[PDB]
């Protein structure tokens, strides 16, 4: 009743609207002739009125597509709109691409040699092993070969650095053995930190020197013997050689020099040999440096000097890290934060970990850690995420690896029913039309063995045969084929399954046409179908004539 | 109709400047268009405007064509040129004759419609122009008589 | 108001309500307020018309392609109270069946997941949904639910086919009573398993996201209030649908659709603009981009 009242109100509004339109025609009517200069009029309202009528109270109101349609895409999207065009011709290249570049087939294949599989009477699985070693080798050789191209630049370098801070740190940190292991990890990281803060300290510090003035002395220390030789402050030179020394020199020189200065590019050097450069706000020098230098440059100072106790380096690093603040997205930074962590607590930070991840590296990272026991990852949301990312990466032909992962991931079932469906889609037609060559056979071979080949082949035939199915509808197929070997295969399939009259006719043919028809009639006894058979026979006769 | 007519007069000078053979053809096409307009001859007001357009520069153009004809009789032949030139001359002859019978009824009606004033001026100004300026057409007629090729002579005598 | 919005939007070119791509991405059926169901073909990105299936007394609303396992079938509903099913036999785009069992307009249609058979579900504006089930030949038997939603139904969406590995199918639809009713079917009849009241006005569209094999089944809904809710079920067999707000615009949201792999929501509505949304690693939804 309320809706009716509103329509009554809506109807009244329309009448008012009609009156307004009439007034506009009455006020706006223009009659110049034969030819007159054009004048403004509410030409548009009439056009809109027709649209309103087509839309047509409550009904019309809640019946006007706000736009109003949403398009859903598989691998991957589609288009949609409503609307400034309602389809977009996207030129492939656009925004997101880093993930695709990182997942260049190889990032998968190589990992497959390491992953292995469980070959059985059907879908197989995966297995772990020296996973860390494998990842290290690949990342190593691969990274090296990658350090040689001709395009992008910045991006490539950044990616490499991030990978080094990811796998590198991971491995470096996967009774005097603990002391020796910390020295070895510290040794690898030190130089590693230097290489990371390179090019930035590279050409940068280059100009710096070939420029002016102080500070550089500090910057060479972040990079020792060459810096000392360039500087050649005799007393400072002897103190500088104590750097790389974790010796209890720190405190002494620290406090004493500060006191001397109070009583009275040198205090900063002393802050470094104190071993607490930033967290000691007493000197107030290496915190204020944060505006001047990269956060990575300040980390290197902490890692290099923080102190001799080979754990304190990582300590101070994490420190300056959680320290910075200007006013998240640095990948290379977030890898450090992941490294600076311990374990357990799985229920929150395992939770940003997903943030970081959101492609292939994140998947491989979680899988190795969980399997190795170092980091038991879990489980379904992480896999859902990997699955769409892997599917996005297939779009351009990433299907086999994704299928294998889907089979192994499961679990323990239900996934198989989905993976099989995906395989069926993959070979519904296009599979049958794009595979119509040698490119399909290799892909079919590659996937873990299962009797899924007949299933894919059969789907392709339907889109566009009987023998393939074997490996009503059958009767129709026979009618179309009123070649011979294929027909025999179809007959064999029918026998395996065991239209009876048709089967008898086929048997007679195998063992004229009129006799076969009579046999079919006998089978029917123990007709549109007969007419269809006659038509098929006529077609066969035409083929014979041809 | 405006675009073609405007183009055609301009082209005729344009035709003359480049390629005698190709200018002549354009002129012939213009003559054909004029003939079509004659055959064709709010809406009434538009017709009156068209009549006004038909009746000083346009009149001069016909005179120029006549002068070309006077030049033409002495030299050339050039039958393909002659046909197009001859056809153009015939069209010029016919349009005035066909137009004049139509025009007198047409012009008075236009004046009545005006009770437009500018179009009426064409009735006044146009009438003054028509007498000519007689000589150039007359010379062409004399040339046609000398030629004794037939046709052109009928339109000239009429 | 609405008139002001109309004035703002003159319309550069004619407009259409819904238009859905075929399976296999070959064809592109459309429909507009002129009563005309046009089938285009998109080979290489170029649009080519194939047929103008005319036959509705009122503007066609939504349109849906059937699965290619049943040949080539397309169904469209309309403001004329009728629903048409067009088959294809060699380019013979004829209608093999027509259904006129609802007394008021038919806002939406959708096809059951292909395993269940060839079931078409249809929500009217009388407040009733009619479902058509295919048999052997040209018979179609109807399972009708009367008074499903109070003042009419706008959206109909099928639950993904979930193997019990004895098969249970659940369907949830929205309407103009503000309730997003889910549906449970046993031997044949369909009963409301639950109601979902979080919208303050007319539910426009309701989309049941495809399960990526994943058991955490989601559904999306949009309404006249201008809110988009992504209702979630934490586990199989627990009648807990916990709604979570995606966003609120000052204007109505017309349509919502799920992108297959990543579960990206295409939110169509508000300001003639369509937004794309992905749930972050933190569980908050974010807008990826403006189309």
Automatic annotation (TrEMBL), chain B:
* Cellular location(s): Nucleus
UniProt signal peptide: none
Q: Which domain of life is it from?
A: Eukaryota
UniProt similarity note? Belongs to the NUP186/NUP192/NUP205 family.
- The name of this protein is MGC83295 protein
TrEMBL record, chain C:
Give the superkingdom in one word. Eukaryota
| Keywords carried by this UniProt record | Lysosome, mRNA transport, Nuclear pore complex, Nucleus, Protein transport, Repeat, Translocation, Transport, WD repeat
Classify the main location. membrane
Main role?
Functions as a component of the nuclear pore complex (NPC) and the COPII coat. At the endoplasmic reticulum, SEC13 is involved in the biogenesis of COPII-coated vesicles. Required for the exit of adipsin (CFD/ADN), an adipocyte-secreted protein from the endoplasmic reticulum.
| Protein family | Belongs to the WD repeat SEC13 family.
* Quaternary structure and interacting proteins, as annotated: At the nuclear pore: component of the Y-shaped Nup107-160 subcomplex of the nuclear pore complex (NPC). The Nup107-160 subcomplex includes NUP160, NUP133, NUP107, NUP98, NUP85, NUP43, NUP37, SEH1 and SEC13. At the COPII coat complex: interacts with SEC31A and SEC31B. Interacts with SEC16A. Interacts with SEC16B. Component of the GATOR2 subcomplex, composed of MIOS, SEC13, SEH1L, WDR24 and WDR59. The GATOR2 complex interacts with CASTOR1 and CASTOR2; the interaction is negatively regulated by arginine.
Q: What is this protein called?
A: Protein SEC13 homolog
Q: What is the lineage of its organism?
A: Eukaryota, Metazoa, Chordata, Craniata, Vertebrata
């Amino acid at each position: 009743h309320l809706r009716t009242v509103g329509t009554r109100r809506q109807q009244e509004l329309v009448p008012l609207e009609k009156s307004v339109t009439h007034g506009r025609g009455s006020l706006l009517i223009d009659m110049g002739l034969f030819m007159g200069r054009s004048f403004r009029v509410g030409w548009g309202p009439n056009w809109t009125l027709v649209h309103n009528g087509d839309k047509l109270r409550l009904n019309a109101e809640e019946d006007q597509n706000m736009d109003t349609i949403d398009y859903g895409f598989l691998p991957k999207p589609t288009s949609a709109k409503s609307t400034e065009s309602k389809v977009h011709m996207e030129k492939l290249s656009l925004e997101q691409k880093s993930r695709e570049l990182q997942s260049y087939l190889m990032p998968l294949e190589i990992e497959l040699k390491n992953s292995s599989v469980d070959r059985s009477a059907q879908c197989p699985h995966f297995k772990p092993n020296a996973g860390v070693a494998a990842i290290h080798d690949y990342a190593g050789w691969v990274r090296n070969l990658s350090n040689e191209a001709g395009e992008l630049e910045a991006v490539v370098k950044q990616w490499g650095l991030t990978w080094t801070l990811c796998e590198s740190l991971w491995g470096q940190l996967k009774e005097p053995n603990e002391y020796v292991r910390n020295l070895e990890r510290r040794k690898a990281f030190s130089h590693w930190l230097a290489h990371t803060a390179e090019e930035r300290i590279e050409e940068e510090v280059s100009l710096y020197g070939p420029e002016r003035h102080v500070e550089a002395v500090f910057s060479f220390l972040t990079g020792i013997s060459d810096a000392c030789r360039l500087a050649q402050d005799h007393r400072l030179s002897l103190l500088l050689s104590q750097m790389v020394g974790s010796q209890e020199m720190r405190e002494l020189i620290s406090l004493q020099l500060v006191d001397w200065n109070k009583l009275q590019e040198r205090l900063r050097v002393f802050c470094l040999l104190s071993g607490t450069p930033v967290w000691r706000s007493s000197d107030n020098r290496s915190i204020n440096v944060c505006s001047q230098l990269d956060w990575k440059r300040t980390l290197a100072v902490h890692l290099w000097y923080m102190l001799p106790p080979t754990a304190t380096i990582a300590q101070a690093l994490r420190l300056y890290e959680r320290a910075f603040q200007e006013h998240q997205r640095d990948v290379c930074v977030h890898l450090l934060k992941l490294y600076s962590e311990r374990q357990y607590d799985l229920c929150q930070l395992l939770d940003p970990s997903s943030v970081t991840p959101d492609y292939r590296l994140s998947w491989h990272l979680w899988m190795v850690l969980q399997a190795l026991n170092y980091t038991h990852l879990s489980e379904h949301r992480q896999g859902t995420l990997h699955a769409s990312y892997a599917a996005q990466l297939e779009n351009v032909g990433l299907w086999e690896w994704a299928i294998f992962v889907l089979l192994h991931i499961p679990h323990p079932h239900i996934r198989e029913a989905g993976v099989r469906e995906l395989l069926n889609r993959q070979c519904v037609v296009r599979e049958s039309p794009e595979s119509l060559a040698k490119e399909n056979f290799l892909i079919h071979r590659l996937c873990v063995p299962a009797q899924w080949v007949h299933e894919a082949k059969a789907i392709r035939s339907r889109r566009d045969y009987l023998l393939k199915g074997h490996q009503k509808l059958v009767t129709r197929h026979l009618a179309a084929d009123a070649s011979f070997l294929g027909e025999l295969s179809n007959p064999e399939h029918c026998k395996h399954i065991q239209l009876d009259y048709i089967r008898v006719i086929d048997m007679l043919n195998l063992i004229g046409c009129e006799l076969e028809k009579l046999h079919t009639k006998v089978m029917s006894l123990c007709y549109t179908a007969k007419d269809r058979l006659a038509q098929s026979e006529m077609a066969k006769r035409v083929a014979n004539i041809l | 109709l405006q675009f073609l007519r405007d183009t055609v007069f301009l082209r005729y000078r344009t035709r003359a400047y480049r390629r005698a053979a190709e200018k002549w053809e354009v002129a012939e096409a213009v003559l054909d268009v004029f003939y079509k307009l004659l055959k064709d001859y709010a809406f009434k007001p538009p017709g009156f405007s068209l009549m006004h357009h038909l009746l000083s520069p346009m009149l001069e153009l016909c005179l120029s064509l006549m002068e070309e004809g006077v030049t033409q009789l002495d030299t050339y032949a050039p039958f393909p040129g002659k046909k197009h030139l001859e056809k153009a001359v015939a069209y010029c002859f016919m349009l005035l004759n066909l137009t004049l019978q139509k025009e007198n009824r047409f012009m008075d009606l236009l004046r009545e419609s005006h009770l437009v004033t500018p179009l009426e001026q064409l009735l006044q100004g146009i009438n003054p122009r028509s007498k000519k300026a007689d000589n150039v057409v007359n010379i062409a007629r004399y040339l046609c008589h000398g030629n004794s090729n037939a046709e052109l002579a009928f339109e000239s005598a009429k | 108001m609405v008139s002001v919005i109309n004035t703002v939007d003159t319309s550069h070119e004619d407009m259409i309500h819904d238009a859905q791509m075929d399976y296999y991405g070959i064809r592109l059926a459309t429909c507009s307020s002129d009563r005309s169901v046009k089938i285009f073909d998109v080979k290489n990105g170029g649009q080519i018309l194939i047929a103008d299936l005319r036959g509705h007394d009122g503007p066609v609303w939504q349109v849906a392609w059937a699965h290619p396992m049943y040949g080539n079938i397309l169904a469209s509903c309309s403001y004329d109270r009728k629903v048409i099913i067009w088959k294809e036999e060699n380019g013979t785009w004829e209608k093999t069946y027509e259904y006129t069992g609802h007394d008021s307009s038919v806002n939406s249609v959708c096809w059951a997941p292909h395993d269940f058979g060839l079931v078409l579900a249809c929500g009217s504006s009388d407040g009733a949904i009619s479902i058509l089930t295919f048999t052997g030949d040209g018979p179609w038997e109807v399972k009708k639910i009367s008074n499903a939603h109070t003042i009419g139904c706008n959206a109909v969406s099928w639950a993904p086919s979930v193997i019990p590995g004895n098969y249970i199918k659940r369907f949830v639809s929205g309407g103009c009573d503000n309730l997003v009713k889910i549906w449970r079917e046993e031997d044949g009849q369909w009963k409301e398993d639950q109601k979902l009241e979080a919208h303050s006005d007319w539910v426009r569209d309701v989309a049941w996201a495809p399960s990526i094999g994943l058991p955490t089944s989601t559904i999306a809904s949009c309404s006249q209030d201008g809110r988009v809710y992504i209702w979630t079920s934490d586990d199989a067999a627990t009648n807990c649908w916990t709604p979570k707000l995606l966003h609120k615009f000052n204007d109505v949201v017309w349509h919502v659709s799920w992108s297959i792999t990543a579960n990206i929501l295409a939110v169509s509505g508000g300001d003639n603009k369509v937004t794309l949304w992905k749930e972050s690693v933190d569980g908050q939804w974010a807008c990826i981009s403006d189309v």
